[PDB]
Amino acid sequence: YSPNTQQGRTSIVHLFEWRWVDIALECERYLAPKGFGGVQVSPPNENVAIYNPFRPWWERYQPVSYKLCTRSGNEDEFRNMVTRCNNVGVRIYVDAVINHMCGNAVSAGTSSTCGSYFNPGSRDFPAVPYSGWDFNDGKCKTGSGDIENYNDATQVRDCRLTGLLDLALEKDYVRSKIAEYMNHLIDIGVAGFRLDASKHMWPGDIKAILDKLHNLNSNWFPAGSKPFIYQEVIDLGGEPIKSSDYFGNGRVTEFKYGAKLGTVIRKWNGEKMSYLKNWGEGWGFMPSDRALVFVDNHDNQRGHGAGGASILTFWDARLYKMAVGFMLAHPYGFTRVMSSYRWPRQFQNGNDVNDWVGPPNNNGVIKEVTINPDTTCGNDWVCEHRWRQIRNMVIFRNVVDGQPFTNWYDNGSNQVAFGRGNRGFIVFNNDDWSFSLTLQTGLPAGTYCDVISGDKINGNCTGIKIYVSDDGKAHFSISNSAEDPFIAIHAESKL
Ligand SMILES: OC[C@H]1O[C@H](O[C@H]2[C@H](O)[C@@H](O)[C@@H](O[C@H]3[C@H](O)[C@@H](O)[C@@H](O)O[C@@H]3CO)O[C@@H]2CO)[C@H](O)[C@@H](O)[C@@H]1O
Ligand SMILES: OC[C@H]1O[C@H](O[C@H]2[C@H](O)[C@@H](O)[C@@H](O[C@H]3[C@H](O)[C@@H](O)[C@H](O)O[C@@H]3CO)O[C@@H]2CO)[C@H](O)[C@@H](O)[C@@H]1O
Ligand SMILES: *[C@@H]1O[C@H](CO)[C@@H](O)[C@H](O)[C@H]1NC(C)=O
Ligand SMILES: *C(=O)[C@@H]1CCC(=O)N1
Ligand SMILES: [Ca+2]
Ligand SMILES: [Cl-]
Structure with a gap:
């Protein structure tokens, strides 16, 4: 049951x-x-x-x-x-x-x-x-x-x-x-x-x-x-x-995970992020210690297998990053990140006729994965695992490993936040208006780099900076127009 x-x-x-x-x-x-x-x-x-x-x-x-x-x-x-x-x-x-x-x-x-x-x-x-x-x-x-x-x-x-x-x-x-x-x-x-x-x-x-x-x-x-x-x-x-x-x-594999997360993030059938407070077994999922979770897999990202139309994929980049971010921040299950290749998706009457297309190739020979100077991939490989927002949340999960789910907050709609012990805190805004509020982070006082909009490099933040005061509170401001409508900070992003 252990990943080794x-x-x-x-x-x-x-x-x-x-x-x-x-x-x-x-x-x-x-x-x-x-x-x-x-x-x-x-x-x-x-x-x-x-x-x-x-x-x-x-x-x-x-x-x-x-x-x-x-x-x-x-x-x-x-x-x-x-x-x-x-x-x-x-x-x-x-x-x-x-x-x-x-x-x-x-x-x-x-x-x-x-x-x-x-x-x-x-x-x-x-x-x-x-x-x-x-x-x-x-x-x-x-x-x-x-x-x-x-x-x-x-x-x-x-x-x-x-x-x-x-x-x-x-x-x-x-x-x-x-x-x-x-x-x-x-x-x-x-x-x-x-x-x-x-x-x-x-x-x-x-x-x-x-x-x-x-x-x-x-x-x-x-x-x-x-x-x-x-x-x-x-x-x-x-x-x-x-x-x-x-x-x-x-x-x-817990396929209910990505299926429900997709419906929630897409706000289908009246679902909303505030409902995620009891995410996990409370949603009918299997025990956390037996679950292998993921947002999408190689089958359902292209309509194969199961999960439905709700499944989020790299094609839905903005919402996908938020779904992956929530998954990587939440303690439930052992996480698997998907890394895909781009194919000429072609919808006809609601279905992708090219859902069979194989990996990037030259006369049947799979193309090598080229790495661009900006760390992204070429040759049609998507490399979601290299997206800053995902790569940094993979590290977030490592940093907060073992910490309890705590300090949950929600506005009764789609603006929620929660922490992982005193090691990490994440804030999401999936409502059609601004999320500007001071929240209890459970983190030590200091200046933290938001790892979604940037990185901590050479003692400085390249993106948004969050200031946690002596009471553990910090102000967060996320416009519904933000490139990525979520902010994440952790012990190792502290200046
Ligand atoms: O000997 C010629 C024969 O070789 C190969 O036969 C293999 C069987 O296909 C394979 O199932 C296995 O047979 C075993 C049975 O499954 C098992 O229930 C029990 O009866 O022992 C059998 C022998 O070990 O192994 C044989 C031998 O390798 C090949 O597939 C045949 O086409 C070929 O005629
Ligand atoms: O660390 C490398 C870069 O990682 C991030 O770039 C990602 C984007 O975040 C991701 O959304 C995606 O770009 C998509 C675009 O944002 C989306 O609206 C559209 O639908 O599809 C795009 C794919 O072409 O992929 C890139 C990586 O290739 C981060 O945003 C960036 O600053 C980092 O440099
Ligand atoms: C942080 O950035 C500021 C502004 O660019 C710069 O003056 C300072 O030297 C940087 N600190 C470090 C540790 O590089
Ligand atoms: C867990 O994945 C592995 C297989 C069951 C066990 O004892 N270890
Ligand atoms: Ca069988
Ligand atoms: Cl699978």
């Missing part, structure tokens, strides 16, 4: 579709000095090379083998990345696609990222190897062989998720091949895993697989370190399967 990050590092970033060499560099030049705890990488195992449409991001969720050979790089490059990141104290978490192999209708051949042969029709994946009796064809009871109704917990686990050949996870052989793959990764140095499509696997089968896993590599981690496990289970209520069914295996 360095003490004081409290977040992981999803460097979606990034190449291994770029992640390795990012660890050394940025993630390490900026206090990021780790990186969730895209599936590192060989997948189907899909040409129609052209190399969609989702082709990586169709395994062909467990060879570490993808568009992100080969095994040597993967190992090089894990080693270099671990050497600077930044962890690597692998997106483990272990519930299935490729779509059952994909043409047999060698159209795979490493050239391995596979035949979906005959259930033949010799590179693993898996054969017909390693899948759930006979176990599934639906007429189509695919998942048709989520109100039936059994078919959700034994049938094909949108046609993806479903592995027979009850078999020791299958459990062992998956464990062989995961242990290869652990011994390489990975600190944990995102278990893809966990709702589609029986809690007990996941447990059986986890029981076969090694402790983390003792060259970098303390003896007895268990891999961090966060299971992707979309539970927004209304279905028989609950996130809690997976608590015995590790943490679980």
Whole structure:
């Protein structure tokens, strides 16, 4: 349940579709000095090379083998990345696609990222190897062989998720091949895993697989370190399967988090920020110590999976920064920051027809992440984790780690504020008028740099400065026209 990050590092970033060499560099030049705890990488195992449409991001969720050979790089490059990141104290978490192999209708051949042969029709994946009796064809009871109704917990686990050949996870052989793959990764140095499509696997089968896993590599981690496990289970209520069914295996993605935060920040259905005072279990969320939270993920930022139209993304920059800021300042859950790439989003009748577009590329080859002088990224990589407002809130969370949620204030509408012990204080204005008021910050008297509008550099603030008096009070002024309608100050932004 523990992330295995360095003490004081409290977040992981999803460097979606990034190449291994770029992640390795990012660890050394940025993630390490900026206090990021780790990186969730895209599936590192060989997948189907899909040409129609052209190399969609989702082709990586169709395994062909467990060879570490993808568009992100080969095994040597993967190992090089894990080693270099671990050497600077930044962890690597692998997106483990272990519930299935490729779509059952994909043409047999060698159209795979490493050239391995596979035949979906005959259930033949010799590179693993898996054969017909390693899948759930006979176990599934639906007429189509695919998942048709989520109100039936059994078919959700034994049938094909949108046609993806479903592995027979009850078999020791299958459990062992998956464990062989995961242990290869652990011994390489990975600190944990995102278990893809966990709702589609029986809690007990996941447990059986986890029981076969090694402790983390003792060259970098303390003896007895268990891999961090966060299971992707979309539970927004209304279905028989609950996130809690997976608590015995590790943490679980809390999709209610971004869904509700999005509706609140967008002020949909009469919701408003003042309602966030009891954010957390009070909103029907799972226990904080089991939650992996995020504003958006690779699926819902483009209409896939679940979360709805309320999901905030980099496309909604201003509101997105505020949502991410609230998440990073609030003690609930373990935080994951999204880092995306820009694609030609094209809405037709309310839906994005280009929701399949893969990462920036030249004839199928993923483009490198270029770093501009102003620290932003080029080649269409968004790099939200490099936005000052987000990067500084990632540090805010580190600085206030362990401090209690306190000194809450709200105007009964959308102007709220709260502190984290005596280490940090944050103020938000999402109303259509100015927020000008003196608030109790719980902070020691002094001059603090607002880390949203600026930075503390060479003993000075580059942005707004906040003055806390002997009584712990400070005046905050945020116009509804402000570039970023929120201010955040903490112990390490004090002059
Ligand atoms: O030997 C030729 C044969 O090799 C490969 O077969 C593998 C199976 O596909 C794979 O399932 C596994 O078989 C095991 C069963 O799953 C398990 O329940 C129990 O019966 O033990 C079996 C043997 O370990 O391993 C075999 C052998 O690697 C390949 O996939 C076939 O196409 C090929 O004919
Ligand atoms: O530290 C680097 C810079 O980080 C910040 O720049 C961010 C913006 O804050 C962010 O909103 C985004 O720019 C968007 C713009 O503000 C938004 O209105 C529009 O819809 O989309 C824009 C994307 O083109 O991305 C940049 C980083 O690329 C910070 O504001 C800035 O001062 C820092 O220099
Ligand atoms: C802070 O900024 C002021 C104004 O530019 C400058 O005079 C002062 O020397 C700076 N202090 C430090 C520590 O650099
Ligand atoms: C937590 O993520 C990991 C898996 C469960 C455990 O004991 N450690
Ligand atoms: Ca399944
Ligand atoms: Cl996820």
